[PDB]
Structures are given as C-alpha cells and as structure tokens.
Amino acid sequence: PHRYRPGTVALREIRRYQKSTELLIRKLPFQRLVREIAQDFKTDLRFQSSAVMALQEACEAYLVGLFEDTNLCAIHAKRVTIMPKDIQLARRIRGERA
Amino acid sequence: PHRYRPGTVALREIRRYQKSTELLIRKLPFQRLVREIAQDFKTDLRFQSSAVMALQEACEAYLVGLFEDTNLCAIHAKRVTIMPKDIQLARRIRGER
Amino acid sequence: RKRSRKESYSIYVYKVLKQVHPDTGISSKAMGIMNSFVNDIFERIAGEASRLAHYNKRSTITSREIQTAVRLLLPGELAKHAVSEGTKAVTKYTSA
Amino acid sequence: RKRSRKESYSIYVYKVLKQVHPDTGISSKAMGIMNSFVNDIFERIAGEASRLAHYNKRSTITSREIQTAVRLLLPGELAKHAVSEGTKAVTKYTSAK
Amino acid sequence: AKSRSSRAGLQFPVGRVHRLLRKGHYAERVGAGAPVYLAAVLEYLTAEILELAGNAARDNKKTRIIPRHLQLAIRNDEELNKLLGGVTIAQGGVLPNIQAVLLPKKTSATV
Amino acid sequence: KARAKAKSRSSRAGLQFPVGRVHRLLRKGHYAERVGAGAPVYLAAVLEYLTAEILELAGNAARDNKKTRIIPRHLQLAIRNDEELNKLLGGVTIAQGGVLPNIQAVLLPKKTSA
Amino acid sequence: KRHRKVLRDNIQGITKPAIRRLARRGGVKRISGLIYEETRGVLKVFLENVIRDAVTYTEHAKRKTVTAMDVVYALKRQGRTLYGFGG
Amino acid sequence: LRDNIQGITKPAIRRLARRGGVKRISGLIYEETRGVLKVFLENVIRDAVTYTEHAKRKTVTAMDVVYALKRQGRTLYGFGG
DNA sequence: ATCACAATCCCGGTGCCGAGGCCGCTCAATTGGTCGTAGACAGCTCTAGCACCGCTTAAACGCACGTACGGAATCCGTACGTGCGTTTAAGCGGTGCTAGAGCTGTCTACGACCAATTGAGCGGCCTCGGCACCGGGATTGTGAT
DNA sequence: ATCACAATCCCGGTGCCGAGGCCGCTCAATTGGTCGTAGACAGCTCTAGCACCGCTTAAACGCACGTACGGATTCCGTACGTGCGTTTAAGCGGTGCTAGAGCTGTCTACGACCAATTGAGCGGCCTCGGCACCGGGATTGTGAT
Ligand SMILES: [Cl-]
Ligand SMILES: [Cl-]
Ligand SMILES: [K+]
Ligand SMILES: [K+]
Ligand SMILES: [Mn+2]
Ligand SMILES: [Mn+2]
Ligand SMILES: [Mn+2]
Ligand SMILES: [Mn+2]
Ligand SMILES: [Mn+2]
Ligand SMILES: [Mn+2]
Ligand SMILES: [Mn+2]
Ligand SMILES: [Mn+2]
Ligand SMILES: [Mn+2]
Ligand SMILES: [Mn+2]
Ligand SMILES: [Mn+2]
Ligand SMILES: [Mn+2]
Ligand SMILES: [Mn+2]
Ligand SMILES: [Mn+2]
Ligand SMILES: [Mn+2]
Ligand SMILES: [Mn+2]
Ligand SMILES: [Mn+2]
Ligand SMILES: [Mn+2]
Ligand SMILES: [Mn+2]
Ligand SMILES: [Mn+2]
Ligand SMILES: [Mn+2]
Ligand SMILES: [Mn+2]
Ligand SMILES: [Mn+2]
Ligand SMILES: [Mn+2]
Ligand SMILES: [Mn+2]
Ligand SMILES: [Mn+2]
Ligand SMILES: [Mn+2]
Ligand SMILES: [Mn+2]
Ligand SMILES: [Mn+2]
Ligand SMILES: [Mn+2]
Ligand SMILES: [Mn+2]
Ligand SMILES: [Mn+2]
Ligand SMILES: [Mn+2]
C-alpha cells in the first residue's frame, strides 16, 4: 500500500485552501444554524438569501483569522497542535474575552 | 546578615504599584521625548502642560495593558519571565504589528 | 477679566450624586472623568441614531432612534434599565 | 414592470479601469467590492471632516477639512499622493470658473 | 413645571441636550421625545456609576469619589467594563490581579 | 444671451469621479450646515486616486492569474500585498477574497534530498 | 400555516471537516480533538452577536425580512466591516 | 533633543511592568519597550500636531491630544472633550 | 521547630488647599405664534422567500493502525533579582520675559436657496467571448529502497 | 542517491451565461440669480508657556554576588493524522404558493423658525473640613537557624 507520513496531507490541504476563496462550511447547515439562532431572538423572521451569504462570508473570515492567531499561540508555546487554550489566549488578547 | 529571596520583592512591588494610580515615568524625561518626537512633524511647537500630562496618562495606561498581555504570552510558554517575543506576539494578535 | 463660558454636566452629576450617596462628595478630576463619560455616551447614542435615521431615509431623530441606538450600544441589563428610564421619562413628559 | 433607481460608482470605476488597464474587465462582485470601498472611504473622510469643522467651531466643510481628514486617515505615501491629486483638482477647478 | 427636566422627572438638562442634538450634525430634525429619552439614559448611566463609585469610596474609608473609585467601580462591573472597554480613566490605575503561577509555593508542608 | 453648453464640474476639475454627486452626498449627509465648492472636488479626486491605485494592482493580479477580468480574489491579492492599502483596509473583509498563501516556517517538513 | 419543523442542535452541522478546512485556510497543520467544540462555541457567540444587531435593524425598519444591509450594518458596528453586499 | 528615548529608564519600565502584574523581566525588554513607546507616541503626536496645524495654532492642546487618542481607539477621560 | 527584623498595620496628630457653597450677572432655555413638509397610514403590485420532492454524488462518518507529538522528568549554566555605595538629575520654587491664544469688530466673498433647463446615468434588453469545467497527458515531490 | 507512484499542474476543447454595449426616458446636476451671514482678517489683551538658576534629596546607576529559571536533552505513552469502506444528507433543478417588500398618493401632526421674556447656570470669591502625611509602637511575614 501507499501511506503519506502524518503532516504531508495536512500541508497539501493548507496549500489548497489558501489558494481558493470558496466557502468551507456547507451552506444548508450554515443557513439552519442562522435561522435557529435568529428564531430564539425573534420568531417569524425571513432572510434574504444574500443576508445568509453575508453572515457566512463574515463568519468564515472571522474564524480563518482566529485560527491564524491561534496557530501563532500554539507555535509560541513550541507546539504544532492548536489547543483550546491557544484560542482562549488569542481571544483574550483580541479583547473578545475577559 | 539576611536578604529577601529573588521574586519576593517583585511581588511586593506588584502589590504596591497595582494599589496606586501615580504616574511611574519621571515627568521631565517624558516631556523631552514628547518635544523631541513633535519636532520631526513641526518645529517651534508649544504644549499646554495638561497636553503633555494627557500623553503621559495615555502612554503609561497603554504600556501597563501591553505588559498584562505580554505577561499572559510569557505564562502561555510556561515561563514567568517576559521576553521581546512575548511583546511581539501580543502586538501581532492586538493587530498593531 | 471674566473667563469665556465653559459648559459642563457638573451641576447635574452632583444632583444625581446627592440622590444616590447624599453623604458623598467628588474630586475635581473625578468630575472631569464623569464629564468625559456623558460626552462619550452622548456621541455614541446620537451617532447610532443618526445612522439609523439615514439607513431608513428619515430626516428626524425620534425617541425611537434613541431607544434602538441604546439597544445597539448598551449591554443586556444596562439596556433594559436604560430603555425603562427613557420610556418612563417620555411618558411622564407627554402627560405633563 | 417598473424600475427603482439605485446609484452606484460603477461607470467611474469602469472609466478609471479603462485608463489604467485598457483591456481588463471586472466581475459584478468585484464591482460590488469597489462600490463598498468608495462608500467606506467617503464616510471616513466626511466624518473626520465633520469633526474637524465642529472642533474648530466652523459651520463649513472646505477642501482644507478634506485635506486634514486625508492626512489623518491615509497612511504615508498614500496620503502624499492623495493630497497632490486633491490640491491639483481644486487649483484646476478654481481656474475653470 | 416650566423646565422640560421637571416635566420629565429628570435632574439632567433636557433643553441643553435638545440644543446639542440640533447643533450636532446628526439629522435635519430632532423630535421632542428624543432629548427626554437621551437625557434620561445619560442620568441613569451617571447614577449607576456614581452608586458603584460611592460604594468604592466608603469601602476605602473616603467621603469623596476620586478617579480610582470610578476605575474600581467600572472594571469590577461586567456591563460597565464592556461599555467602557476602549476607555482610559486618567489616574485610575488597574485592579489588583496577580496570576496564580507568580505566587510563592505557600512554604507547603508545616510551619 | 445664450447661457449653456453644459460643462460638468468633473471636466472643470479634470476628474472621472462625479463632483456633482459628491457635493450632493455631502449636503445630504448631515456633516455640516454648509459645504464649500472645493470640498467635493478634493474628495472626488481622492476617491479617484485610491480607485486608480487598487485597480492598477488588481489588474496586475488578474493578468498574473491569466484572466482578463478582475475578481474579488484579485482585489484581495492587490490589497493584502500592499503595505499601505493593507493598513488602510486592515479592518475590512473582502467577500470571496480568501487569504495570502502563508505557512509558518516551523510547520514545513525537516531537511531532505540534497 | 404548515409551520416549518422545529430547529434543534444545528450547531452540529458545523462538522469536524468544515472546521478542519477553516483551520487549513488559517495555516493550521495539527488540531487537538477539543478544538471542534471550542470552535462551535466561539462561532455561536459571533453569530448570536451579529444576528442580534441585524434583527435590531430589521425591527427598527418594521420588516420581518433580515436584509443583507442589516447584516452589513451589524458587521460594521462590531468592527467587522464587510465589502461586497451593499457597503 | 538628542537620544531622549533613554530618559525612559530601566527602573521606570520595571514599574510599568509591575503595575501590569509582571514578576520577572528579560534584559532585552527595556529596548523593546522603548521601541514600542516611541511608535505609540509618534502615532498619537503626529495626529495631535495635525489638529494643531488645522486650528492654525502653534500650541498643542490637551484637546488636540484627546482627539488624537480618540482616532487611535485609545479614548482618554479626564482632559476634556 | 525558634528568632530576628523589616514590613505592615493602625492610631491620633497636624497643616494644607480645593470642594463646595453664596452671590449677581447674563445668555440660553422657555413661551406662544407661524408655516411647511415628513412621515403615518391606507391601498396596490409583484418580487423573492419558502416548502416539498427525488435523485445523484460527494462529503461525512467510524474505525484500524501507527508514529510523531506533547509533556513529564532531569540536569547545567548564567541571566536576572537583590542590595550596597556612589552619582545624577528630577522636582521644587521663585523670578523674569513674551508668544500667541482667544476674544472683538468690521465687510464681503461665498454658499444656501430658488427657477428653468437638459444630458448624465439610470434600467431594460440583448449577445457572444471569458472562463469554469473537463479529461488526459507531463511533471513534480514523497516515501521506499 | 535512485527508483515507482500518487497528486498536482497544465493544456486545449466545450458550451454557457453574465459582462458590457446600445438605447431611450427621466431625474438630478447645472445655469443663473438673489440674499444674509461665516469667517478672514486686523487689532488688542493678558494668559500660561518657557528659560533660567540654586538647593535638596530621592531616584538612577553600576557593580558584586548567588538563586532559580530557562533551555537543552532524554523518554515514554497515546492523541492525532491517514486511509478504508459505509453511511448520510447536501446540492440541484423543479414546481407551487403568497407574504411582505416596497412603491404611490393623501394629508395633518409635529418640528423649524422666530421674537420676547427671565431664571438656570456660569464665573468670582471665600473658607474650613477631608485627607495626605507623619511617627509612635503593635503584630505579621520572610528567611536564617
Ligand atoms: Cl421624539
Ligand atoms: Cl472649499
Ligand atoms: K419579496
Ligand atoms: K498663553
Ligand atoms: Mn496602465
Ligand atoms: Mn486617623
Ligand atoms: Mn468649584
Ligand atoms: Mn442665585
Ligand atoms: Mn430659562
Ligand atoms: Mn414623503
Ligand atoms: Mn464503519
Ligand atoms: Mn517533542
Ligand atoms: Mn524635592
Ligand atoms: Mn516650577
Ligand atoms: Mn505679539
Ligand atoms: Mn492670532
Ligand atoms: Mn473675505
Ligand atoms: Mn445600466
Ligand atoms: Mn457583446
Ligand atoms: Mn464562442
Ligand atoms: Mn459556466
Ligand atoms: Mn480533471
Ligand atoms: Mn486553457
Ligand atoms: Mn442572460
Ligand atoms: Mn450590467
Ligand atoms: Mn444615450
Ligand atoms: Mn446635467
Ligand atoms: Mn451662482
Ligand atoms: Mn463671526
Ligand atoms: Mn525550569
Ligand atoms: Mn432550487
Ligand atoms: Mn398582503
Ligand atoms: Mn408594509
Ligand atoms: Mn409643536
Ligand atoms: Mn461655579
Ligand atoms: Mn515606629
Ligand atoms: Mn495592630
């Protein structure tokens, strides 16, 4: 059989996704999560299709950006593996978290 | 005779300076820096004395906050000692670069 | 002589301080911080109300633009209480 | 059916595009981004210009408020080049009375 | 009730706020209700911080609120800390706060 | 006493961006009680200059990608590879922009081959 | 009025691979197993915050339809200015 | 106006660190801190001086500095505005 | 464990000066009237959001397996904290000089507003050239050897 | 180094739909003119920014010395990445329905503008109580033993 060493496919994936601009969360699931959260604030809301796409573009860019900062927090600690404490530090220094 | 162990005084200094609100940079060296920096943008400038005080309040509060974020970056790396790489990471994530 | 008029919320801060802590006073610098605060929140609320009127093609800022501004700008409980005091104060003014 | 007139900067962005890259087009999404970009910087400069007037107890937004707003808002080289284009356009227009 | 404040049940000055709203490049027009709501909101937020600030003063055995009291009041209140997250209080200092790992080991055993 | 051969304020200023439009948006914007004649000319000129600058770099990105049309990815490549446009738009998300290729050195595999 | 089904647990439609993809765009090589639930939580807070402001604009305008512009105005408030939907 | 950055002394920086909760400080922090301070002050003073020039004054006001700090997302209370 | 001893606490004393009240002058808030249009409100059209459904796939999933990772545990060298004596210059205060901020009054250039005017820029309508998608070769890197 | 072999890269062919051009109608920018007022400008006042010097003394400095920290090293266990076959539901293209977006026309409550009136709030002046600062001498906390 053929077997890539751990990290080789992960590195290919970084090269592929940094090359493209396509939304990475499947759209239907994203749209139901938007409607469930919106419902809990006010019932009987409709959405322009473009309103859900604006939220998905904003959410994806926020998370891609957060994962950058999170990666730098992992590497600061001499790790290669992002952990929840890295997200927590990046969010604390960003002023998102107390 | 007898001497305080390393870090015992540093703790005491934290307790002292976190209890107090006083400005911690000598005002006259700060005033000379402000004037020196100003001159590069416009020569023969005067300053209200309260103008220099506003700048001192804003700079020390910023640096104190930066030192809090730096400290968290140091502890994140399993250190108790702050290093330049700690300031740089806090500033990168703050989006200052 | 006679310095140029310099307006402040000082008399109103003291009137509210005396309602809340009748036995408490306030330093000159603390009154400066309280003035900065009123000016800051005035700016933020009026700014949001401005945008809100414009997004909706309105020439007028009503208490309704102030309420929505307040809901956008204040956290949770501060907002609930702020809306309540604001609504209560309009109502009681509309009647008298 | 009817219409509903919505103004955008599209024709000016095309004209400028034709000047700098005569054989390049632009997708409706890219044009959407350029429209966002123009509206954003407009609001920033006029906003800053509003404050400048207000801070100085002035009723009128002049080219000088725009100029100061530009130096505050744009970085470095972009500000220098922006001010020259601004100054040149106002000089030219005031001759073309 | 000649004054709009008295009519509104307010300490804060409705007439002044109406003027600042009009002179302030916010809209061509300002409804009568707007400066009542806004004055009210400003009073309420003022009361809220002067309440927590007064408490800080008593806690520190002082008669007079100083900037430090305003700083202790705001930074110890979740909602006010979030409202004023971008703001420096001149002469406020910071909250006493030392990260657990910096503390000594408690001698740790006996004596 | 024939008055008009219509002459745009844009043409008077030597601009592609609409001085007329920009004046009207400044009078409708509740920015100040009055707007001077020069304000809209200067502002329209600054919006033209920045547009030219983005389109110059975006056009080049398109040409590198073997395309005749600028897409949002080209605007993102232009903006994020330029120090000053990047600072000016540091808090802005370009929809369908993606990010710059950038892998932290430590994540690259160890020395191999020759 | 048929009433659409009840929406429950849709946070789980933000799957482990979708979150891997986002991390990969963000330059991430290796991912602890606790990252997936932390990300879901962070995303929920972000979405709740922007949707709350956006529905507030929708309410203010007396609509039952959240527009792209209400989201764009909500993103701008939060310092997350978005170009390409009527900026 | 020669080399006034070194007027920000090792001990002054150590006090600021202390108020920021820092127990131990590398020897390279002092020069790093001075760099960061110069950059902060340059950015705020450039904007303040810009408000001065627009007001056709030759005297930098508190208010010039307060407007400068506000533009930089560093809003300061207690100096007017 | 005991035992300095510096730090810390609390106390009443003491002397400074800015909080806060009184006064009286003034300008900005209120009153009562006019007048124009913003926006509520109702009616009407029809865009676009939503709902259901049946395939076809690609993505999502759970699981087997192993290796590179993270973290625990140890050791060694010196960076950095502490404390001393010695040097530096901040802070104080008091005097002496003038820049320029901040206010006034004058007068007019300039921008609001209005009417009449006309072409710049809008949406509707159409098309064909750019490019997304494809399949199929070459070329590039990885992991085995 | 020297292979086989995956996965990516690149190419021209295919066909589809949105970029971009035309076209004609209309709203908004322009022309020209009137009227009043903001601010440029010039003059004058006195605030407060600056220079300079002498003394007092606390802070900065630099140097000795040694602890406890950071960093290099070795190790071991299993958390993760990779790849397989199975399972799942997104995506697509389709119809079918109407809610509510968004536009128009109507028409009066409400907010701008104004003049005249007066009392709320401002600066000026004054003092005395809060609190900063001190040292007496008390109990606690740190580190030597
Ligand atoms: Cl109202
Ligand atoms: Cl002008
Ligand atoms: K619709
Ligand atoms: K002066
Ligand atoms: Mn060119
Ligand atoms: Mn006592
Ligand atoms: Mn007073
Ligand atoms: Mn009185
Ligand atoms: Mn009155
Ligand atoms: Mn209307
Ligand atoms: Mn299975
Ligand atoms: Mn390792
Ligand atoms: Mn002294
Ligand atoms: Mn002095
Ligand atoms: Mn002079
Ligand atoms: Mn002058
Ligand atoms: Mn003139
Ligand atoms: Mn068109
Ligand atoms: Mn064609
Ligand atoms: Mn063809
Ligand atoms: Mn296609
Ligand atoms: Mn293919
Ligand atoms: Mn090709
Ligand atoms: Mn078509
Ligand atoms: Mn088109
Ligand atoms: Mn035509
Ligand atoms: Mn025209
Ligand atoms: Mn004219
Ligand atoms: Mn004037
Ligand atoms: Mn260690
Ligand atoms: Mn469909
Ligand atoms: Mn209906
Ligand atoms: Mn409706
Ligand atoms: Mn009325
Ligand atoms: Mn007073
Ligand atoms: Mn004693
Ligand atoms: Mn005791």
Numbering used by the authors:
A (entry chain A): 38 to 135
B (entry chain E): 38 to 134
C (entry chain D): 26 to 121
D (entry chain H): 26 to 122
E (entry chain C): 14 to 124
F (entry chain G): 9 to 122
G (entry chain B): 16 to 102
H (entry chain F): 22 to 102
What did the published study say regarding this structure?
DSB recognition by and activation of PARP1 is proceeded by actual phosphorylation of H2A.X13, which ultimately culminates in γH2A.X foci formation to induce a cascade repair response. Here, we produced γH2A.X using a hybrid chemical approach and assembled nucleosomes with either H2A, H2A.X, γH2A.X or mutants of H2A or H2A.X as the incorporated H2A variant. Additionally, enzymatic assays were performed to shed light on the catalytic parameters of PARylation.
In order to shed light on the basis for the variant-specific differences in PARP1 nucleosome association, we sought to obtain well-diffracting crystals with NCP, which required screening of different DNA constructs. The structures of H2A.X-NCP, γH2A.X-NCP, H2A.X-S139E-NCP and H2A-NCP were solved at 2.85, 2.75, 2.2 and 1.99 Å resolution, respectively. The conformation of the C-terminal tail of H2A/H2A.X is highly variable beyond residue 117, and in the X variant structures it is too disordered after residue ~124 to model. These measurements show that PARP1 has a systematically higher affinity for the H2A.X-containing nucleosomes compared to the H2A nucleosome. Compared to the H2A.X nucleosome (KD = 73.2 ± 0.3 pM), the γH2A.X and H2A.X-S139E nucleosomes have the higher affinity for PARP1, with KD = 47.8 ± 0.1 and 43.8 ± 0.1 pM, respectively.
